[PDB]
Design a protein around this nucleic acid. Structure first.
Ligand code: AGS
Ligand code: AGS
Ligand code: AES
Ligand code: AES
Ligand code: MG
Ligand code: MG
Lengths: 432, 432
DNA sequence: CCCCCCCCCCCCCCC
DNA sequence: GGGGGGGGGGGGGGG
């Protein structure tokens, strides 16, 4: 999977007339710029292009669309275009359009216009879909990334980048999505319903079997026919019994595979998190952090067995383990959230090396700024040859840039600036 | 007027055995240290000492109290001591104590022990109060600053420092708290009750007067009749006068309140406007302002209470838009600090007390430099008046350099973790 | 009449 | 809005 080029028109501080573009490097796309230049907007456009999700608190009132009053028109059309290649060689472009009207009554109304996923063959166009509902499905499907991963891990909004350190209910929600826990309980539950239904049939069938057996002893129509219906019903009974077991064994197999998958996944995730923490965190006070999962089970013959995962991020010091929630510093929260997202990206999409880190050194001190950068350099070096990585870093931290030593990977970087009209523009610069 | 010495024992990463102290300088207290040193804890304990409020997300599970498991004991008692001077010369110390038990049921529970406000006559201690409910009221009076200002503005938790940029209701609640509208609106309602009651008496009185007028006219004992007519008429006029006095008093009260609200918002926006133009490096935002929208019609909760809506606007050229859902991370951080500086300056203009915890979060190099230079200008201007007590926590080295603390400081404080991973506060010297 | 202590209420907080 | 814990308040009792 790979993302090639992004096009932005009329989104936030990007003007409505002339599209601005950025092309993504491998293994690293570096984006710098002043406060309010428009860097975070770039990642907003990647998330919108891939999922149709708009930034939180910007979904209505057209905060996402370049404000009509600034340009002097009563209507502004926004457009985002993303070109990418699927896991197989294939080449796609997704376009999305959104409109913002200022009516004569000053009322603003936002409307989502038609978009399109189109396939390019040898450089020539074919329409795959023009329905926004399918685009979400199709793009992630082509990219090789679940939507829950695009949303929470890869294109995580800067305002939301600390979700791993949030309250338990919220944390659970995001892991439940990432693990699709609602989907598999619905699987288990449907099988259970079917099993109960086949169970009701079996009671009726055994009755009938007892009845047809007796008619055969009395006949013993006629005894030759009397044996026929007895046999027909006997087979339905035995056949139903077998069906009941198969549904039951299958139900158990599904539950077991699901429970082991979850364990394996969590074991991998905690390993990476432990490695990332021990390498990068300079403090002595926390040796490692871990995601601990507490399963709540409720078992009844009517509701069968339903598992509920509760999740916690704990920090480990010596013998002691404590829940980090409500107990970690601003800087610790920032580092833990980045590492956990890296760990999830590595476990859940082991092969698409895609993640956006928007201003990773927030609240980090000088030592941690250095080590984080060197760890990022270390991740890149290890995976550069494999061709796996498309990593996007946004920063204006000069200390961070210096220690990353990105020139080893980059021939260029992108700078987002405001022009004289105060429009966001994206200029490509030489690594020099 | 001033805060002198703080003592911390068994709170978070501070060990339960030996208390750490910090002494506050004028005009500036500088506090540095690595991620997780315990710098934010210091500000929490200041809040806790003055208002009794604990850090958000820490009122349960005793997250604020140094964890019993770390020591090898099952119970920890925390203590925080703050010595300060009232608006008058008087010298006080408030002490608060907290306990966190690992119960017979295994999970932790926290309990609030005895507290004390103690007055110092040099060489003699006197308990002014040992009422944990009363400490809040007494302390805030002595400091000369309202409880909601200590909470939102002076000692605002780092996790909460962006509240000005929060959702409308959340912003409104805090401005509401800051604007104590309940006490006086209830005064108005009680006057209104009386005014209405005199109104009914007036209706009955006017009737009786018409009756007495006719009897006087019939007599034209005539002297008796004129007496009764006058008597009744003077009662009518007297009641009218009483109605007018109550009515005018009601209006004077209500008017005084609207004037106060207007006056403050005006000063607040003046200060915010100067700071923005003075501090913000960037062409895209000329100024920011706080707009107050009154709900056309006051809702009735045991009185008629006006409902204000508040919004933070950014101004560029002719155009104005709401910052909510539209500003960058750095812009949120800068706007929130400036709004707090302005809130301190207008609402407790007399005592220059504020804590800035990691003020350069997500700020670019230029905005880091200019913010530092603006603080320098604020300090230089008011140093002579002796009012100012500014507390800055930072590990931003470029920021420290532009701050030029040597002009104002003879020493600064460093927070460290000792070999046992306990937070320690070390005092260090500066050249000038 | 002051207050002190306990248990319980209710209140703020967090969900 | 509700639920739970804990602080505080409330009421009864004693100093
Ligand atoms: N609807 C809108 N119309 C016009 N301008 C907008 C709109 N919404 C947001 N903006 C502005 O566009 C900019 C968006 O920039 P961001 O991508 O958040 O900046 P940034 O580069 O991430 O800066 P940071 O986060 O401080 S490092 C902000 O400066 C907003 O003030
Ligand atoms: N109940 C607790 N028991 C023991 N340690 C705790 C407890 N609560 C918090 N801590 C630790 O104490 C530290 C809190 O110190 P802070 O003041 O938040 O850090 P800081 O100096 O502000 O660092 P920043 O915000 O990253 S610059 C963290 O490292 C926590 O791991
Ligand atoms: N997207 C990169 C995911 C990743 C890949 C590798 C590592 S490492 O711990 O083994 F160095 C960490 C994170
Ligand atoms: N606590 C007061 C903060 C403050 C805020 C603003 C100023 S001004 O001189 O630049 F208008 C001065 C002081
Ligand atoms: Mg940003
Ligand atoms: Mg902190």
């Amino acid at each position: 999977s790979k993302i090639e080029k992004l096009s932005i028109l009329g989104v936030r501080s990007f003007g409505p007339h002339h599209p601005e573009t950025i092309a993504f490097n491998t293994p690293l796309t570096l984006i710098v710029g002043y406060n309010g230049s428009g860097k975070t907007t770039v990642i907003e456009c990647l998330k919108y292009a891939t999922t149709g999700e708009l930034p939180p608190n910007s979904t209505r009132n057209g905060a996402f669309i370049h404000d009509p009053d600034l340009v002097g028109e009563k209507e502004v059309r926004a457009q985002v275009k993303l070109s990418f290649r699927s896991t197989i060689g294939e080449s796609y472009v997704v376009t999305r359009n959104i409109q913002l009207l200022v009516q004569r009554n000053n009322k603003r109304t936002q409307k989502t216009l038609e978009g399109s996923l189109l396939l390019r063959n040898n450089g020539e166009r074919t329409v795959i879909s023009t329905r926004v509902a399918e685009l979400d499905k199709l793009v992630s499907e082509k990219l090789g990334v679940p939507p829950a991963i695009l949303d929470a891990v890869i294109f995580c909004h800067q305002d939301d980048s600390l979700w791993p350190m949030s309250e338990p209910a919220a944390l659970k929600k995001r892991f439940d999505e990432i693990f699709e826990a609602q989907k598999y309980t619905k699987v288990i539950e449907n099988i259970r319903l079917l099993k109960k239904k086949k169970g009701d049939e079996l009671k009726i069938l055994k009755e009938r079997e007892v009845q047809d057996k007796a008619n055969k002893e009395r006949a013993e129509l006629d005894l030759k026919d009397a044996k026929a219906k007895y046999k027909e019903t006997h087979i339905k009974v035995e056949t139903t019994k077998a069906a009941i077991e198969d549904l039951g064994r299958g139900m158990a197999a599904v539950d077991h595979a699901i429970m082991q998958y979850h364990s394996k996944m969590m074991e991998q995730i905690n390993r990476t998190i432990a490695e990332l923490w021990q390498s990068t965190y300079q403090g002595t006070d926390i040796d490692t952090i871990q995601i601990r999962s507490d399963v709540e089970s409720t078992t009844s013959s009517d509701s069968g067995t339903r598992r509920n995962y509760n999740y916690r991020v704990s920090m480990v010091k010596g013998d002691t383990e404590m829940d980090m929630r409500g107990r970690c510093s601003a800087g610790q929260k920032v580092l833990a959230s980045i590492i956990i997202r890296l760990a999830l990206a590595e476990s859940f999409c082991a092969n698409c090396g895609l993640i956006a880190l928007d201003q990773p050194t927030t609240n980090l001190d000088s030592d941690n700024i250095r080590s984080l950068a060197e760890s990022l350099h270390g991740i890149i070096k290890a995976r550069q040859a494999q061709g796996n990585l498309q990593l996007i870093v946004i920063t204006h931290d000069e200390e961070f840039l210096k220690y990353m030593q990105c020139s080893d990977f980059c021939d260029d970087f992108y700078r987002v600036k405001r022009d004289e009209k105060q429009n966001s523009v994206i200029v490509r610069e030489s690594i020099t």
